[PDB]
Design an enzyme around this catalytic site. Structure first.
Site, mmCIF file in Angstrom:
data_model
loop_
_atom_site.group_PDB
_atom_site.id
_atom_site.type_symbol
_atom_site.label_atom_id
_atom_site.label_comp_id
_atom_site.label_asym_id
_atom_site.label_seq_id
_atom_site.Cartn_x
_atom_site.Cartn_y
_atom_site.Cartn_z
ATOM 1 N N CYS A 140 -7.905 -37.226 61.494
ATOM 2 C CA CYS A 140 -7.425 -36.150 62.403
ATOM 3 C C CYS A 140 -8.630 -35.437 63.022
ATOM 4 C CB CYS A 140 -6.550 -35.148 61.660
ATOM 5 S SG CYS A 140 -4.996 -35.861 61.063
ATOM 6 N N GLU A 174 -7.684 -42.690 64.152
ATOM 7 C CA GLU A 174 -6.307 -42.927 63.653
ATOM 8 C C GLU A 174 -5.337 -42.362 64.696
ATOM 9 O OE1 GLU A 174 -3.538 -42.350 59.651
ATOM 10 O OE2 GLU A 174 -5.591 -41.561 59.638
#
Ligand SMILES: [Zn+2]
Length: 263
Positions: A140, A174
């Site tokens: 993140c 991601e």
């Protein structure tokens, strides 16, 4: 009821998304966060008391980058559990698709700070799996709202690939990315690739930049500098086309000289 807004340092920030602040904290309309240790408190009075008591004036862990008044801190999830949990719950207020808050031991966190006489003030961060099966160099990533669209987003993106280069590996964030995430990654990828081609196969570009072949292809596709021939991507670069595109550099950049980090 969800947490509606936070006080952190001198900032009031409205929430964008649900964040599971546990038990009675999650039932508070406003949380007061220490800007240094990120401890979340229920009331103005507990916050003001903590302001006077807390000795933290920077993130915990190792200062692995310092150039002028910008510093990056490396915080291992195993060594600084409470801090990393606090950070994940703060981040989740402004990230839709973040799913991990408490199980932080498998992660390292990179905290972007701008420094003054008082201390090192958190601007943003990215989390990273210590071991990524899918080769994600960012789990993140977030710039806190009052800092968004001022160069800080692209700084942490750049920093993530400087780590990947020193690791001698390729990496991709991601997914999914936010709308801002998508635009910032594209801008960074474009800038890096244009600056290289200004002065070589897709594999060569991947080894130099630590950007995945797929991310390079999608970027060269957006720049119309790739062609498809008998099932192969072919770089079709023109020095005039490259120079015309460049006719931008982010306000702040990562200086590898000032990065003190080994895998
Ligand atoms: Zn504190």
């Amino acid at each position: 009821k969800y947490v509606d807004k936070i006080h952190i340092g001198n900032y009031e920030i409205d929430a964008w998304y649900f964040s599971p602040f546990p038990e009675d904290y999650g039932k508070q309309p406003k949380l007061w966060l220490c800007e240094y240790c990120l401890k979340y408190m229920k009331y103005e009075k507990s916050y003001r008391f903590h302001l006077g008591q807390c000795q933290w004036r920077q993130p915990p862990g190792k200062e692995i980058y310092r150039k002028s008044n910008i510093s990056v801190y490396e915080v291992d999830g195993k060594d600084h559990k409470i801090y990393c949990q606090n950070l994940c719950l703060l981040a989740k207020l402004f990230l839709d698709h973040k799913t991990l808050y408490f199980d932080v031991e498998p992660f390292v966190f990179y905290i972007l700070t701008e420094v003054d006489r008082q201390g090192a003030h958190i601007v943003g961060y990215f989390s990273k799996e210590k071991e990524s099966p899918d080769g994600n160099n960012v789990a993140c990533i977030l710039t806190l709202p009052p800092y968004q669209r001022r160069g800080y987003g692209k700084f942490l993106i750049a920093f993530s690939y400087e780590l990947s280069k020193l690791e001698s590996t390729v990496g991709s964030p991601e997914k999914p990315l936010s709308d801002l995430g998508k635009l910032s990654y594209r801008s960074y990828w474009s800038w890096v690739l244009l600056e290289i081609l200004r002065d070589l196969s897709i594999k060569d570009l991947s080894q130099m930049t630590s950007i995945t072949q797929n991310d390079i292809i999608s970027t060269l596709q957006s720049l119309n500098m790739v062609k498809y021939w008998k099932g192969q991507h072919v770089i079709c670069v023109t020095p005039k086309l490259v120079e015309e595109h460049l006719k931008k550099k982010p306000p702040i950049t990562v200086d590898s000289v000032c990065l003190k980090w080994a895998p």
